Design an enzyme around this catalytic site. Structure first.
Site, PDB file in Angstrom:
ATOM      1  N   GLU A   1      -2.015  20.143   5.240  1.00 13.20           N
ATOM      2  CA  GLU A   1      -1.884  21.609   5.763  1.00 13.20           C
ATOM      3  C   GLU A   1      -0.785  21.681   6.857  1.00 13.20           C
ATOM      4  O   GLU A   1      -0.199  22.767   6.946  1.00 13.20           O
ATOM      5  CB  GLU A   1      -3.296  21.777   6.649  1.00 13.20           C
TER       6      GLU A   1
ATOM      7  N   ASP B   1       0.892  -1.261   0.000  1.00 12.29           N
ATOM      8  CA  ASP B   1       0.144   0.008   0.109  1.00 12.29           C
ATOM      9  C   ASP B   1       0.771   1.393  -0.294  1.00 12.29           C
ATOM     10  O   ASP B   1       1.723   1.333   0.729  1.00 12.29           O
ATOM     11  CB  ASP B   1      -0.915  -0.102   1.185  1.00 12.29           C
TER      12      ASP B   1
ATOM     13  N   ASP C   1      -3.638   8.004  -4.971  1.00 11.81           N
ATOM     14  CA  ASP C   1      -4.135   9.099  -5.684  1.00 11.81           C
ATOM     15  C   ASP C   1      -3.608   9.169  -7.230  1.00 11.81           C
ATOM     16  O   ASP C   1      -4.581   9.265  -7.968  1.00 11.81           O
ATOM     17  CB  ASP C   1      -3.607  10.502  -4.886  1.00 11.81           C
TER      18      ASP C   1
ATOM     19  N   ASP D   1      -1.317  -0.198   6.058  1.00 11.56           N
ATOM     20  CA  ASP D   1      -1.807   0.627   7.285  1.00 11.56           C
ATOM     21  C   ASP D   1      -2.937   1.764   7.073  1.00 11.56           C
ATOM     22  O   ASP D   1      -2.837   1.993   5.676  1.00 11.56           O
ATOM     23  CB  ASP D   1      -0.599   1.369   7.824  1.00 11.56           C
TER      24      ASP D   1
ATOM     25  N   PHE E   1     -12.600  21.092   5.868  1.00 15.72           N
ATOM     26  CA  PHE E   1     -12.424  20.545   4.716  1.00 15.72           C
ATOM     27  C   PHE E   1     -13.366  19.280   4.736  1.00 15.72           C
ATOM     28  O   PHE E   1     -13.554  18.559   5.370  1.00 15.72           O
ATOM     29  CB  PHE E   1     -11.170  19.702   4.523  1.00 15.72           C
TER      30      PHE E   1
ATOM     31  N   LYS F   1     -14.807  18.986  -1.923  1.00 14.74           N
ATOM     32  CA  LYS F   1     -13.367  19.545  -2.171  1.00 14.74           C
ATOM     33  C   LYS F   1     -13.450  20.858  -2.427  1.00 14.74           C
ATOM     34  O   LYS F   1     -12.488  21.334  -3.459  1.00 14.74           O
ATOM     35  CB  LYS F   1     -12.689  18.873  -3.014  1.00 14.74           C
TER      36      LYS F   1
ATOM     37  N   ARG G   1      19.010 -44.078   4.804  1.00 14.45           N
ATOM     38  CA  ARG G   1      18.502 -42.685   4.786  1.00 14.45           C
ATOM     39  C   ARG G   1      19.718 -41.985   4.695  1.00 14.45           C
ATOM     40  O   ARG G   1      19.731 -40.932   3.764  1.00 14.45           O
ATOM     41  CB  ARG G   1      17.611 -42.323   5.853  1.00 14.45           C
TER      42      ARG G   1
HETATM   43  C1  LIG Z   1      12.825 -38.205  -0.166  1.00 13.17           C
HETATM   44  C2  LIG Z   1      13.380 -38.141   1.119  1.00 13.17           C
HETATM   45  C3  LIG Z   1      12.790 -37.040   1.938  1.00 13.17           C
HETATM   46  C4  LIG Z   1      13.143 -39.234   2.018  1.00 13.17           C
HETATM   47  C5  LIG Z   1      13.796 -40.510   1.470  1.00 13.17           C
HETATM   48  C6  LIG Z   1      13.225 -41.621   1.926  1.00 13.17           C
HETATM   49  C7  LIG Z   1      14.231 -43.127   1.571  1.00 13.17           C
HETATM   50  C8  LIG Z   1      15.526 -42.250   2.105  1.00 13.17           C
HETATM   51  C9  LIG Z   1      13.964 -44.300   2.511  1.00 13.17           C
HETATM   52  C10 LIG Z   1      12.228 -44.438   2.594  1.00 13.17           C
HETATM   53  C11 LIG Z   1      12.015 -45.997   2.041  1.00 13.17           C
HETATM   54  C12 LIG Z   1      13.668 -46.672   2.500  1.00 13.17           C
HETATM   55  C13 LIG Z   1      13.649 -47.834   1.794  1.00 13.17           C
HETATM   56  C14 LIG Z   1      12.746 -49.092   2.343  1.00 13.17           C
HETATM   57  C15 LIG Z   1      13.022 -50.344   1.610  1.00 13.17           C
HETATM   58  C16 LIG Z   1      14.213 -50.526   1.484  1.00 13.17           C
HETATM   59  C17 LIG Z   1      14.532 -52.074   0.787  1.00 13.17           C
HETATM   60  C18 LIG Z   1      15.921 -52.695   1.571  1.00 13.17           C
HETATM   61  O1  LIG Z   1      16.234 -53.675   0.863  1.00 13.17           O
HETATM   62  C19 LIG Z   1      17.048 -51.627   1.296  1.00 13.17           C
HETATM   63  C20 LIG Z   1      16.664 -50.396   1.923  1.00 13.17           C
HETATM   64  C21 LIG Z   1      15.259 -49.828   1.280  1.00 13.17           C
HETATM   65  C22 LIG Z   1      15.676 -49.376  -0.123  1.00 13.17           C
HETATM   66  C23 LIG Z   1      15.113 -48.261   2.140  1.00 13.17           C
HETATM   67  C24 LIG Z   1      16.091 -47.284   1.761  1.00 13.17           C
HETATM   68  C25 LIG Z   1      15.949 -45.957   2.399  1.00 13.17           C
HETATM   69  C26 LIG Z   1      14.459 -45.720   1.963  1.00 13.17           C
HETATM   70  C27 LIG Z   1      14.147 -45.521   0.262  1.00 13.17           C
HETATM   71 MG   LIG Z   2      -1.933   3.528   4.750  1.00  9.48          MG
END
Ligand SMILES: CC(C)CCC[C@@H](C)[C@H]1CC[C@H]2[C@@H]3CC=C4C[C@@H](O)CC[C@]4(C)[C@H]3CC[C@]12C
Ligand SMILES: [Mg+2]
Ligand SMILES: *[C@@H]1O[C@H](CO)[C@@H](O[C@@H]2O[C@H](CO)[C@@H](O[C@H]3O[C@H](CO)[C@@H](O)[C@H](O)[C@@H]3O)[C@H](O)[C@H]2NC(C)=O)[C@H](O)[C@H]1NC(C)=O
Ligand SMILES: *[C@@H]1O[C@H](CO)[C@@H](O[C@@]2(O)O[C@H](CO)[C@@H](O)[C@H](O)[C@H]2NC(C)=O)[C@H](O)[C@H]1NC(C)=O
Ligand SMILES: *[C@@H]1O[C@H](CO)[C@@H](O[C@@H]2O[C@H](CO)[C@@H](O)[C@H](O)[C@H]2NC(C)=O)[C@H](O)[C@H]1NC(C)=O
Ligand SMILES: *[C@@H]1O[C@H](CO)[C@@H](O[C@@H]2O[C@H](CO)[C@@H](O)[C@H](O)[C@H]2NC(C)=O)[C@H](O)[C@H]1NC(C)=O
Ligand SMILES: CC(C)CCC[C@@H](C)[C@H]1CC[C@H]2[C@@H]3CC=C4C[C@@H](O)CC[C@]4(C)[C@H]3CC[C@]12C
Ligand SMILES: CC(C)CCC[C@@H](C)[C@H]1CC[C@H]2[C@@H]3CC=C4C[C@@H](O)CC[C@]4(C)[C@H]3CC[C@]12C
Ligand SMILES: CC(C)CCC[C@@H](C)[C@H]1CC[C@H]2[C@@H]3CC=C4C[C@@H](O)CC[C@]4(C)[C@H]3CC[C@]12C
Ligand SMILES: CC(C)CCC[C@@H](C)[C@H]1CC[C@H]2[C@@H]3CC=C4C[C@@H](O)CC[C@]4(C)[C@H]3CC[C@]12C
Ligand SMILES: CC(C)CCC[C@@H](C)[C@H]1CC[C@H]2[C@@H]3CC=C4C[C@@H](O)CC[C@]4(C)[C@H]3CC[C@]12C
Ligand SMILES: CC(C)CCC[C@@H](C)[C@H]1CC[C@H]2[C@@H]3CC=C4C[C@@H](O)CC[C@]4(C)[C@H]3CC[C@]12C
Lengths: 884, 363
Positions: free
Chosen positions: A279, A145, A447, A582, A320, A325, A845
């Protein structure tokens, strides 16, 4: 009583935390996706319990097992129900209270931030709503704004028109806008400009010191820089220009409606109060010009200046009015645009005055707050007609129109003002940061529209390489507005984009999540907008046209107009919209957005109370969106899948014990592990993640604002991530159960002295140790930064698991362990199982993360590698580009 | 007025940002791999040198003769690391008992086995059970924590208690409260085991096996001697052959100093129950032939269940189970393999670590 006490006391502490940091109804998108994920978790629970009941019934309808010898289809139903009682921690009320704790902590961390607190008016960032903080990390549109948010609403008198001649000297922001739009080297002439204004103001202050005693205040509020008027009023044209400027000063110092009452507490300082800032600016620039106002009075304006005494009682004050006006008032001797005073001429005289009209065009070059002052300068008849017209009939309008038409025709101009409203400190840098982050920001100006686009080019919402698709469609001149607006919008959509289609493109853009490419610009005015948001097809057409990268300006908008614009961008083409503003109109603009920020600007705090956040200046919104917004968004986007995974890793593990035991309904864990797992064992690490996890430092998140694009695209939190975390939890539960089992499966004598483990509670201790350790180490693995507090509390959560097993078992009240800690934690088999189970839970993981940070690394991985290398090392701790 | 400071109200804590750079991942995937292979071989070597004798005698009443005969190779399992090919089929002999009228399980099974090595100073003789379901919901909750704790709990405290109460076996038809109540205590393994391993060759030195200390000492702080009056309690429906005259002033079992009962009142988590019944913590069990006289009382062929003896010195990680070593070695080998794959990806095709030109907007 210790049954369900912790819920109420935590509700009370959350309420008191909300009520403590506030004195000095809107649900986020993450919450709705949370509801859907909870539904999916319940679907998983139902599948689990159905399989449990089916297998239990099949077992009861099987060969004569050992049940009917030592133990003595409603059986399926009771099995299903005891399974539901077993597998019920998939999604407890712990999620919906942990999320509230997380949001409250994020809100009080936004509040307690020192770089969001404005020390000028002593007003920090006060979150009016403690439930939408992840909503800031996905803000896609910002509807600003121009009234008092971008510009500081501090009017400054710059130019004037005396005797049909322009007097004044000031470099406005619109001039820089022209220089940037034409292609002149901006941000470079400022050096020499400052170096010349230095000597200009030096000679100015020498002239003030040599002129009088300077009875005004300290020179900090001496906004008088234009010496040219003082140079020409003395001896340029002799006494003529002196006579003109003195008449102008008297007309501006006597004809006004500002309520002066210098008090609270000393009468030294002035307390000029007026509902309009123009003013006040005029009387202030008349005071600082040399015609100050010493002392005060109740009836009249007694002014003494070096000998001259002025008290000209007008006997009537014409306030005013916002509808007409206009007021006809001529001062005896012993106000808007040209649509009210001009455009009424003889259809060969008053040529010089016509020249003065051209000065308006020059005022259109810089776009200031200007007006025309024309007074008509035989004495008895004047006061006679005055007193007989002061007591007219029927609201005093007919005779007033009569005289204004018979004698107030073909006036002569003797006054003219010019006032500017400059941007706040750090607004261009803030807009540049919000544009680098990919936030398509809209400016709902007021304006004038030409000054609006000039200022937009002055700040960083407009820049080069843009296409200014001007949609100021009011007619053929620069018949009905609807059809011409439609044709112009269609022509723009056809010749500037390839958009052959009407309905399919709306659904296509809704499934696009927004990606601003090909920097463009659109400008709408009042009538062309009020005809653009009424037709259902016209609505989607204007929305598809206004899906450009950054610049969308809307001038002469009403409160309902801007509210409907925010609704059109919010409801249709469902996105996250911010509506910082605001004022009273900005109240309606805010109440109808996903996030509403309120600038604590003018005396009216209506846009601060009826909002979601309340910042002092406009610049803070950057740190509110680029730093805290992205932080809380990624915090929730990591916490929710972490929570569902840590619940799955436990419930599925309790389910795997149902393979054996034939799903009869015996708990693998003690009755107190099922509660303390979600309550104390694994609850604090994920909350401290969602509260204290930082994507990168604030300096890095403001240096690389493009990281914010992970929130605009919803690339962090989606159902795919939740499903992947749930599958990882399923696998980790498989590991957590079948590693202790496989330790036992051979001979069941894994106790280092043969004395005998293998009570299902002790195998449960094994499994729970593996699961708690894997959960905490998982929270730590997926945490972007490991700090002194979250790592300490992860270690302390592991220690809480161990210590409370030791406390509960080493007490006769456990009734089935009585030594579970001293019996399980002492065998090397337990630690041997635990370490390899944690390794096998965290290895896939961590590996997928490694092969992701190597093959397809996200932008945050690269930015973190640079931030560790020491690119962003030349900046201090609390850095923000939005500062002078 | 203004907010606080110090680096907590502002999220500026002393942190460590863990950037997984290839100069930190490989020093982690290798420090973990060598540790999990060192312990993976240290465990698997410690586990290899674990002697083990399993002898299932559930088929001794109807498949053994009155004379000595080799046990079929399906029942027994010898595992001696010093002698990999030590078949030496052990023998068994079933001597019936016409006095006992329990036809389903009676008599005595005498099992002669031969151990070609010693067992160092701590020999455990457990009994293993198979296809006996001791983990079911109604079973594992079928006992009274008031009678175990030594209280003379009345029928209300014993039967109308919380989820842990003897629901089906609270009171007999007469009106007495079963002192050890519930499906757990009632269904106790009552095969009598000898107090000494009879030496077949040199009967002058028998390997004595004591039944004291076969359970945790701390269990004697929870299982307390009863306080009943022998006029309110009756034997469980299956203890009626051990106490034909019910209870009197003397024959009330002291569950505090009865460690077989305390072992059985700890229900086995899985379908295979293995509970210690004889221990020797003084003498090393020397090599030779030994005879074990098990008095068959507990019937298992009614539900195809198996029962046997399990003789072992044990280990630090329990018995002989090739899992902890195997899974440690597999974890270490997987760590090393994934680290080699990561090094290949970092060598055979990958980005610079802090490649500013790889960002999505710098494309
Ligand atoms: C995408 C991000 C955020 C998350 C990833 C999730 C991954 C890392 C996790 C979720 C499911 C998991 C899998 C589940 C099943 C198996 C089969 C096993 O024989 C080997 C591990 C494996 C392959 C895991 C690997 C890790 C895995 C793939
Ligand atoms: Mg304002
Ligand atoms: C060793 O424990 C055994 C655990 O089952 C136990 O077997 C049970 O013995 C009772 C008799 O004491 C049997 O009950 C039989 O006799 C009653 C007499 O009225 C009948 O009504 C019953 O229908 C049944 O025929 C149980 O059936 C039997 N249970 C099993 C599974 O076989 C032994 O008796 C115990 N022996 C000793 C010496 O302690
Ligand atoms: C060792 O265990 C023996 C079990 O057979 C037992 O010796 C007796 O009972 O049996 C022997 C063989 O049947 C016989 O040679 C002995 O003469 C028997 N002894 C007695 C006292 O009758 C004893 O329990 C143990 N023997 C010794 C010598 O301690
Ligand atoms: C209490 O009962 C037990 C068994 O029910 C009695 O023990 C029996 O005693 C008789 C004679 O004393 C012996 O012939 C039996 O062999 C014993 N049986 C067992 C299993 O030991 C005991 O004597 C009874 N006590 C009293 C005081 O009557
Ligand atoms: C190992 O030696 C201990 C004593 O050093 C034996 O314990 C004794 O056992 C006898 C026989 O039951 C009891 O009468 C004594 O009261 C026990 N003494 C103590 C101090 O407990 C134990 O039985 C021996 N074990 C074996 C297998 O021979
Ligand atoms: C030879 C036959 C009888 C073996 C079958 C054993 C049955 C009772 C057990 C052993 C393996 C178990 C399965 C293991 C895996 C899963 C996948 C899970 O998402 C649903 C439960 C389910 C499907 C289990 C159902 C019960 C199950 C099939
Ligand atoms: C080798 C002999 C002893 C195994 C006998 C038990 C078998 C038939 C049963 C018991 C436990 C069951 C497993 C339990 C867990 C899982 C993980 C799940 O994601 C797939 C099914 C799977 C893999 C099941 C397969 C069948 C299974 C191994
Ligand atoms: C089934 C698909 C979707 C994923 C494959 C995962 C497989 C390869 C992995 C994950 C968990 C692993 C199981 C974990 C536990 C056991 C129980 C044990 O007594 C036999 C091996 C067995 C059964 C493993 C076999 C392999 C296994 C099932
Ligand atoms: C010296 C004798 C009397 C001690 C008897 C108790 C022993 C066997 C028990 C009690 C405490 C147990 C230790 C507790 C803590 C750990 C740390 C862990 O990382 C390795 C296993 C280890 C080292 C355990 C090994 C076995 C242990 C030392
Ligand atoms: C990854 C690592 C930490 C797993 C830990 C395994 C531990 C708990 C187990 C595996 C092998 C075991 C050791 C085997 C041998 C001995 C030598 C003996 O004189 C003292 C006990 C001691 C030292 C045991 C202590 C516990 C032990 C070290
Ligand atoms: C990286 C991955 C592929 C390593 C997998 C190791 C696999 C191939 C090896 C290592 C240990 C082996 C197992 C050892 C024990 C058993 C139990 C037996 O009753 C069936 C075979 C089975 C189940 C083997 C199957 C193959 C096996 C699981």
């Amino acid at each position: 009583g210790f049954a369900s006490v912790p819920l109420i006391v935590i509700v009370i502490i959350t309420a008191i935390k909300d009520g403590i940091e506030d004195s000095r109804t809107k649900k986020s998108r993450i919450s709705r996706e949370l509801n859907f994920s909870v539904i999916l978790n319940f679907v998983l629970l139902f599948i689990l319990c159905f399989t449990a009941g089916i297998v239990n019934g099949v077992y009861y309808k099987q060969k004569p097992r050992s049940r009917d010898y030592f133990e003595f289809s409603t059986n399926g139903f009771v099995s299903f129900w005891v399974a539901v009682i077993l597998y019920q921690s998939l999604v407890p009320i712990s999620l919906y209270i942990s999320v509230e704790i997380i949001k409250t902590a994020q809100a009080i961390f936004i509040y307690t931030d020192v770089l969001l607190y404005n020390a000028k008016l002593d007003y920090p960032c006060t979150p009016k709503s403690w439930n939408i903080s992840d909503d800031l990390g996905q803000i896609e549109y910002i509807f600003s704004d121009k009234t008092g948010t971008l510009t500081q609403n501090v009017m400054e008198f710059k130019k004037c028109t005396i005797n049909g001649v322009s007097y004044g000297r000031a470099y406005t922001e619109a001039l820089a806008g022209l220089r940037k739009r034409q292609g002149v080297d901006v941000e470079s002439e400022g050096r020499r400009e400052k170096e010349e204004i230095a000597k200009d103001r030096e000679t100015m202050i020498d002239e003030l010191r040599s002129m009088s005693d300077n009875t005004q205040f300290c020179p900090e509020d001496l906004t008088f820089v234009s010496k040219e008027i003082v140079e020409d009023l003395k001896g340029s044209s002799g006494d003529h220009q002196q006579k003109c400027c003195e008449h102008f000063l008297l007309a501006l110092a006597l004809c006004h409606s500002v309520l002066v009452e210098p008090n609270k507490d000393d009468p030294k300082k002035l307390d000029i109060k007026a509902q309009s800032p123009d003013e006040s600016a005029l009387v202030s620039t008349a005071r600082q010009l040399g015609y100050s106002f010493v002392g005060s009075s109740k009836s009249g304006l007694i002014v003494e200046i070096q000998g001259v005494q002025k008290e000209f009682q007008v006997l009537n004050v014409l306030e005013f009015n916002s509808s007409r006006k206009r007021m006809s008032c001529i001062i005896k001797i012993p106000k808007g645009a040209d649509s009210v005073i001009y455009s009424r001429l003889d259809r060969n005289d008053a040529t010089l005055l016509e020249k003065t009209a051209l000065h308006l065009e020059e005022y259109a070059t810089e776009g200031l707050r200007t007006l025309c002052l024309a007074q008509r300068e035989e004495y008895e008849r004047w006061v006679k007609t005055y007193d007989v017209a002061a007591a007219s009939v029927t609201n005093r309008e007919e005779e007033l129109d009569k005289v204004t038409d018979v004698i107030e025709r073909e006036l002569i101009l003797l006054g003219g003002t010019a006032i500017e409203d400059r941007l706040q400190d750090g607004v261009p840098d803030s807009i540049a940061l919000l544009a680098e982050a990919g936030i398509k920001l809209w400016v709902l100006t007021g304006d004038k529209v030409e000054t609006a686009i000039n200022i937009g080019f002055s700040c960083n919402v407009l820049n080069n390489d843009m296409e200014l698709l001007v949609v100021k469609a009011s007619g053929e001149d620069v018949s009905d507005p609807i059809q011409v607006v439609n044709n112009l919008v269609t022509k723009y959509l056809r010749e500037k984009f390839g958009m052959s289609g009407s309905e399919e493109e709306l659904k296509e853009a809704k499934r696009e999540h927004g990606l601003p490419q090909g920097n463009f610009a659109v400008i709408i005015d009042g009538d062309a907008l009020k005809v653009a948001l009424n037709g259902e097809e016209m609505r989607r057409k204007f929305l598809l046209l206004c899906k450009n990268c950054k610049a969308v300006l809307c001038c002469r908008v009403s409160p309902a107009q801007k509210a409907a614009v925010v609704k059109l961008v919010k409801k249709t083409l469902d996105v996250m919209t911010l509506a910082i503003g605001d004022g009273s109109n900005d109240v309606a603009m805010i109440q109808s957005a996903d996030v509403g920020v309120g600038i604590a600007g003018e005396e009216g705090r209506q846009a601060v109370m009826c909002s979601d956040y309340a910042i002092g200046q406009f610049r803070y919104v950057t740190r509110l969106v680029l730093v805290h917004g992205k932080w809380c968004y990624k915090r929730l986007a990591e916490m929710i899948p972490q929570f569902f995974y840590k619940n799955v890793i436990f419930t599925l593990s309790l389910f795997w014990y149902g393979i054996y035991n034939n799903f009869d309904g015996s708990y693998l864990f003690e009755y107190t592990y099922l509660t303390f797992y979600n309550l104390a064992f694994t609850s604090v690490p994920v909350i401290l993640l969602a509260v204290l996890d930082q994507d990168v430092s604030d300096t890095v998140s403001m240096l690389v604002p493009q990281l914010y694009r992970v929130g605009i695209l919803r690339k962090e939190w989606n159902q795919t991530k939740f499903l992947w975390y749930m599958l990882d939890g399923v696998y980790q539960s498989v590991i957590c159960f079948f590693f202790p089992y496989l330790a036992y499966h051979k001979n069941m004598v894994v106790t280092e002295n043969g004395l005998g483990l293998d009570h299902r509670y002790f195998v449960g201790v094994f499994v729970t140790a593996i699961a708690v350790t894997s959960c905490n180490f998982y929270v730590f693995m997926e945490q972007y930064r490991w700090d002194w507090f979250c790592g300490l509390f992860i270690c302390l959560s592991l220690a809480v698991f161990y210590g409370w097993t030791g406390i509960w078992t080493s007490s006769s009240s456990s009734n089935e362990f009585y030594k579970g800690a001293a019996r399980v934690f002492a065998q090397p088999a337990y630690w041997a199982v635990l370490f390899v189970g944690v390794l096998f839970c965290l290895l896939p993981r961590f590996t997928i993360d490694c092969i992701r940070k190597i093959f397809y690394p996200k932008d945050i991985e690269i930015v973190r590698e640079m931030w560790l290398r020491g690119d962003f090392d030349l900046y201090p701790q609390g850095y923000d580009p939005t500062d002078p | 007025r203004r907010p606080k400071e110090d680096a907590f109200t502002q999220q500026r804590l002393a942190a460590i940002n863990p950037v997984l750079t290839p100069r930190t991942v490989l020093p982690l995937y290798l420090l973990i791999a060598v540790v999990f292979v060192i312990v993976g071989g240290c465990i698997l070597a410690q586990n290899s040198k674990v002697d083990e004798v399993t002898i299932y005698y559930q088929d001794c009443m109807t498949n053994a003769t009155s004379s000595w005969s080799d046990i079929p190779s399906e029942h027994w399992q010898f595992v001696f690391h010093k002698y990999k090919t030590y078949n030496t089929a052990p023998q068994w002999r079933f001597v019936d008992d016409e006095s006992d009228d329990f036809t389903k399980q009676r008599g005595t099974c005498q099992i002669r086995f031969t151990t070609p090595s010693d067992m160092k100073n701590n020999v455990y003789l457990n009994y293993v059970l198979e296809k006996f379901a001791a983990n079911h919901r109604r079973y594992v909750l079928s006992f009274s924590e008031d009678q175990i704790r030594g209280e003379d709990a009345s029928y209300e405290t014993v039967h109308d208690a919380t989820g842990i109460n003897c629901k089906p076996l609270s009171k007999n038809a007469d009106g007495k409260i079963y002192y050890p109540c519930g499906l757990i205590a009632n269904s106790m393994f009552n095969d009598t085991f000898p107090l000494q391993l009879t030496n077949v060759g040199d009967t002058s030195n028998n390997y004595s096996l004591t039944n004291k200390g076969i359970n945790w000492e701390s269990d004697k702080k929870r299982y307390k001697k009863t306080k009943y009056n022998y006029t309110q309690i009756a034997p469980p429906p299956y203890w009626e052959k051990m106490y034909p005259d019910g209870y009197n002033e003397t024959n009330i079992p002291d569950i505090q100093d009865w460690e077989e009962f305390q072992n059985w009142m700890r229900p086995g988590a899985f379908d295979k129950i293995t509970k210690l019944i004889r221990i020797n913590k003084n003498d090393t069990l020397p090599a030779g032939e030994y005879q074990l006289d098990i008095g068959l009382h507990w019937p298992v062929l009614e539900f195809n269940g198996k029962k046997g003896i399990y003789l072992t010195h044990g280990s630090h990680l329990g018995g002989r189970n090739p899992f902890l070593g195997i899974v440690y070695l597999i974890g270490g080998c997987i760590c090393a393999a994934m680290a080699l794959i990561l090094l290949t990806f970092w060598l055979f095709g990958g980005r610079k670590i802090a490649d500013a030109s790889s960002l999505s907007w710098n494309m």
